[PDB]
Subunit: 811 residues, 2 copies
């Protein structure tokens, strides 16, 4: 064998090649036409290219010889991120820039043929308005956030009112702290729980003959949370912004629950508002809870629910919270004494389902609730990894029992006093595969036919196929998407059509509309049909040779998957240099059968310079159950590279053109962390390491993430020590050219402190580094000029220290 | 000629190279002479001084005669037993006062109670203060009393009655940064970094006697209000915490601190106990009495304690004033408006500030520590000696006499004073020195005045710009400036208070720093004439250092008119036929001369270590440097960055003709602070000359630097749009090389002077202009690199960078 060498370009010549070589539809919704005679069945509304609202028409019959391309009809007159709806009126609502707008299409006021004009919601608010949500009960009321407080605005009467008076926007950060109706830093980053207020879909009637609308919300008080100083984006000022960051082992925000009551008289104006806190403290009612993972209302509207975790995140609880638990707020001490006794004892919180595990609770969106079937029962579907070790739907019926705790007593509650008995727990699915419940995946639930649809890993972990099965008497799981592709699917609310954003490794991404059929003898059975196309493909894209997906049976008893990009125009005899992209952290799988030319376009660019690009999903990656993910608990850093080195040596034996005297590693966030761990642990295997936003020291990262995977720092001092590359600075090479550090100077998530503190110890260890800073970038890179420079320095750094003979000369 | 290429060592090898090279390796200061007054005794004087074994007070015995056959070494008798930066002394009682860490201690020696023959135990001054007590000062009138600062307020403490008392209630320590930020007795950031004025309060040297038998002491003090000053954030040394400390930094063009004089009258009874302390504001605002003044440069008191004096600059630093301020100008602080109005009218209109000297210049005023007031001979006049470049363009001594006239300004009348209303007439202004050379007045250089013989001793550049020398001259009939120090060495000097001895710390390019005592005699026929004699050695030289070839001081007649000096490090073992890679070291900014006849082996050791590995090392002092007059220095006024490289190149090209071993196709440049600024400018302006540029803590953008410096040399930003733009490398990022392995930035992450945002914002524009950089951060370091482990890693990454991108053949291959 004789080593291949890559093109020694200049700096500007590399900028040439990048500069030269150069979003999908989403948020679908279905509305049927109520059309006695006419042709079209449905009219859908969705978001795509500024990025705004489109609509389309679904024909009742198609010429099955030809392929129907559906038309992108524009819904608006002239981006848009997330919209709301109310079918009973047709009332839309959405955000675009600072302003909020509304139209009508479907309901009592017709189907518009042409693009209807966007009518604005006017305001008496001094600041930007965030997170607009429609009330289902009243189609005319909406709610939104303004300076960490909830307002409501009426888009016909033009009547506005501030509901929560918590955040004093004139007072500064250090003294203020509180919020009401927004999620904190942790709950948005680590739990994808972006909103913090939820409308009630019903309204109680008053003695005057009107209604009372309801809004649930949490009240965070971040007073004990650590203040941290990130540098301000305007480097001109030479100042830093103070923002709250609950570091591992420190206090999280003082969470507690609240609820509103808006009396609307017969005319439609607000009578009088009542703001309501809990009957007792959050510590006493919900004992040992330290996070509010999700919340919302029952379709009934009688109970408001919330999923609640303990601090270590090893105890999920689903609790029902009836509005009769809340009382109005009062400064008068003995008036509240009277308010508490008038509320009964039997009106009590109800833990309808508790579960534990010695790994962790992965929080998911899936929680369908059925209408109140029997009197003191609640039928509901829920997902859980706890039982089998894999996420499966369990139909549960919990007895809504009167509590053994009476607050009148004076005594304090025991741990089991709000635990409901279980009538049943029917496992709807089962196996060595999971149901998906994050990133827009959930469950479409037919209640007449009594079915349930879902995404999962049944056919393969590499493909996210659509599946269907009954919830009453469950059994066989019917696949609804063609093999070889991966699918992020959306089913109709009427269960007759479904749309499937799909791609694979060779062919780019598309979208397709599909019709579901069902024999009239048997509701259970369902078959699909290729109905239409919403977006045609980009074809075998020019200059793009993808990687062939490989798997290998690991020495740890797992089928570890991987992507292998081979050098474009392959030379037998001449072995090539090798580069290894990586993330290998929780909540993320890189290797699946999907088009990796969109986001991972550069990997292909490296393949067309003579770099062997390899990618592996080590133990810890998602979509493969709790036991596979759970491998690294308390042991982040320690195992991951050994899986990568193993999977690399499978490619080394099979394909000997991979030169293991020229091995490079690169990644972002956790990816950069492992890239440092690679060079630190395996100096012998790995030549160069390029660390993007490296987590160098786990005591600096937030609670929500780190306590989940590593526990509380005090009870795992070694796991933190071993998992923190900053401590182990002496273990790095005494050889330059092998350690590049890349980091955004304004990083809120993986603080630049990680890099600076690592560098501090690297300096006193006497260890060389190379370093680039992108001073205008936060966590990722969200500016063209920075991104251009990153890629430009990446390819040149590899060229100068891995690929070409000048790099071979440096040793 | 064929190229030379340096030997490639690894990172691991060079670390050992630099370690071993350093495997080997503070002088005395703050001297004082006290007479033994022992006719029978063998010693005339005893000298006290600060030095290291731990920096502390020592002493030696100065004999009345010596064995002139051999060299007498002086025994360093330690005064103490338990770091002392500075110390105070009262001649009358023999009382030492000095901060040492947290505590403020005192001992007695050499006064009326005699001279000890062993160490003395330091006696702590006890305290109710929670925090560390900074800036101790003995009251000259009463050595029982002292003053100090605590949380930016003046406290006084008696060291026998144990009485303590806070004198100012300005800064409240429990309240945070933004909501408070006032101070009394303390010098602000700008006054310490740019003007080297470290104290902000001054004891009135004499005591007034009350009718009862007690006495009044006085402390003049500066009261600063930093409310309007820019609050800048720098990262906290505790990286652990991931926080940033706030402090006040007047950026170029922004608000400076708002200042004023205040006086504290301390009435003490006949027992030594505080009766009452009155705090006194000025009778009119500082804005009105001192029109135009931005900085209180220096302050103090006349010998008699009759007037407080003050040296005052306007914001542009073109106008300087010396103003006498009577204590009668200060009236008590009264909230009661009817009471104040009476206290205003109590003071006569005839009492008024006295601008006893005023001068302008179109270049700038360099502040200095030379100012000597005489005994008051005539009752409505004052004599003094002062230094100035404003007359000839070179810093010289002038014996000014000023007439303390009554002002035409009466406060009574109600209006504001005219610009000339406080200006005294100058009765005479005798020039004591003159020529194209300067007297020195900073970094401890100062005059000593023999008031009996009517002479003045001083340091200057008369013989050479490369050698500081002591001189003596009359101030009555000034003429022959007699040199006292021996030629061939440069001299930092100290003269005895009795003018019969002088100490020198001297060195030269070959010989390390030696410290010698010399005795000053005079012949009976002419007391104007003075002659020295080698009396003893205080500190002996370390002797020419092993493996240190010192450089040679060259010079060239520049095309700009001036005789520019430099230093040349020839590579060790020259190979005729082979041409070496060149490394240009630079500061090349104001207030600094690198090139002079001193031993550069201590500080600039690695310039030699570069030469031993086969690098030519050049250092040039371009137009802007100190010690060559104001005209020379002024060169880059409004033009920083624009002219310095032209001088550096010209010197480099001068060396290239005289020596062909300079490979001009492989030349690098390196420097710190202003050195790093010009190192960036070298690459930005002269790509063709300079392969690599290694820039330490570089000033990238002049609006981000402080008022006191930046406006001195560049004026107000509004008044010099172009000079700022052209002088700011951050604003000209597009003009950098697209070739990598040329630009290297170094910067201390915790820097207070040249904030790291200079470097970060340069990178911001280098990125969005697609230009490559290399970077090293030193996260535990401020402006200069302090921690030894951090310094070694800089020295290492310097040599390796030079090796891979300039020196060795692997660098040549990279094209």
């Amino acid at each position: 064998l004789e080593p291949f060498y890559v093109e020694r370009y200049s700096w500007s010549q590399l900028k040439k090649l990048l500069a030269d070589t150069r979003k999908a539809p989403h948020d679908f919704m279905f509305v049927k036409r109520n059309d006695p005679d006419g042709p079209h069945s449905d009219r859908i509304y969705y978001l795509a290219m500024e990025n705004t609202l489109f609509y389309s028409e679904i024909p009742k019959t198609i010429n099955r010889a030809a392929v129907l391309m559906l038309s992108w009809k524009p819904l608006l007159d002239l981006g848009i991120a997330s919209y709301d709806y109310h079918q009973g009126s047709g009332t839309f609502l959405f955000q675009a820039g600072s302003g909020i707008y509304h139209v009508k299409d479907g309901g009592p006021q017709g189907f518009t043929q042409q693009p209807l004009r966007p009518n604005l919601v006017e305001t008496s608010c001094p600041n930007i308005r965030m997170d607009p949500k429609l009330c289902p009960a009243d189609p005319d009321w909406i709610a939104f956030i303004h300076s960490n407080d909830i307002w409501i605005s009426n888009i016909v009467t033009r009547e506005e009112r501030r509901l929560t008076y918590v955040h004093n926007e004139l007072a500064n950060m250090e003294e203020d702290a509180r919020s009401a109706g927004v999620a904190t830093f942790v709950l948005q980053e680590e739990f994808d729980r972006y909103s913090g207020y939820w409308w009630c879909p019903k309204a109680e009637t008053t003695p005057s003959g009107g209604k009372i609308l309801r809004i649930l919300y949490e009240e965070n008080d971040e007073s004990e949370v650590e203040i941290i100083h990130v540098t301000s984006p305007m480097l001109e000022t030479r100042r830093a912004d103070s923002f709250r960051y609950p570091k591992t082992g420190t206090a999280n925000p003082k969470v507690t629950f609240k609820m509103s009551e808006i009396m609307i008289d017969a005319e439609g104006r607000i009578i009088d508002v009542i703001d309501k806190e809990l009957i007792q403290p959050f510590e006493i009612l919900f004992e040992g809870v330290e996070y509010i993972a999700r919340a919302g209302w029952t379709p009934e509207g009688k109970y408001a629910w919330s999923i609640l975790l303990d601090r270590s995140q090893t105890r999920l609880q689903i609790v029902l919270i009836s509005p009769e638990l809340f009382i109005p707020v009062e400064d008068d001490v003995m008036e509240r004494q009277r308010l508490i006794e008038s509320v009964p004892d039997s009106v009590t919180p109800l833990i309808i389902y508790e579960e534990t595990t010695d790994i962790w609770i992965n929080i998911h969106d899936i929680f369908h609730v059925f209408p109140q079937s029997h009197e003191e029962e609640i039928e509901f579907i829920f997902a859980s990894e706890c039982k089998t070790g894999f996420r499966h739907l369990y139909k549960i019926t919990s007895i809504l029992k009167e509590s053994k705790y009476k607050r009148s007593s004076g005594g304090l509650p025991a741990p089991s006093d709000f635990k409901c008995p279980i009538k049943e727990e029917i496992a709807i699915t089962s196996g060595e595969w999971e149901v998906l419940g994050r990133h827009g995946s959930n469950i479409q639930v037919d209640e007449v036919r009594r079915l349930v649809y879902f995404e999962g890993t049944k056919d393969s972990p590499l493909e996210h196929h659509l599946y269907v099965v009954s919830y009453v008497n469950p059994g066989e799981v019917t696949r609804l998407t063609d093999r070889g592709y991966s699918h992020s699917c959306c089913i109709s609310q009427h269960c007759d059509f479904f749309i499937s954003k799909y791609s694979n490794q060779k062919n780019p991404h598309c979208v397709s509309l599909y019709k579901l059929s069902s024999p009239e003898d048997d509701p259970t059975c369902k078959t699909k049909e290729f109905w239409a196309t919403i977006l045609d493909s980009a074809g075998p894209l020019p200059d793009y040779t993808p990687p062939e997906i490989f798997s290998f049976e690991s020495t740890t008893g797992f089928t570890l998957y991987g992507m292998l990009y081979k050098p474009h125009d392959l030379q037998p005899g001449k072995k090539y240099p090798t580069v290894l992209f990586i993330y290998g952290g929780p909540q993320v799988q890189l290797v699946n059968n999907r088009f990796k030319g969109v986001k991972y376009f550069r990997l292909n660019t490296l393949a067309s310079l003579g770099y062997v690009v390899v990618v592996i999903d080590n133990r810890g990656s998602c979509h493969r159950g709790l036991k596979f993910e759970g491998a690294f608990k308390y042991k982040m850093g320690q195992i991951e590279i050994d899986d990568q080195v193993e999977g690399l040596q499978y490619l080394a034996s099979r394909y000997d053109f991979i030169d293991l005297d020229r091995v490079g590693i690169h990644g972002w966030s956790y990816g950069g962390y492992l890239s440092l761990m690679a060079l630190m642990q395996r100096s012998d295997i790995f030549r160069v390491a390029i660390a993007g936003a490296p987590v160098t020291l786990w005591i600096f990262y937030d609670t929500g993430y780190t306590e989940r995977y590593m526990g509380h720092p005090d009870q795992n001092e070694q796991g933190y020590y071993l998992g923190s590359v900053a401590m182990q600075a002496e273990k790095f090479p005494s050889e330059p050219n092998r350690l590049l550090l890349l980091h955004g100077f304004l990083d809120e998530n993986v603080h630049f402190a990680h890099t600076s503190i690592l560098l501090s110890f690297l300096v006193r260890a006497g260890k060389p580094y190379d370093l680039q800073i992108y001073p205008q970038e936060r966590h990722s890179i969200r500016v063209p000029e920075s991104g251009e420079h990153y890629e430009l320095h990446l390819l040149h750094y590899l060229q100068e220290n891995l690929g070409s003979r000048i790099a071979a000369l440096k040793v």
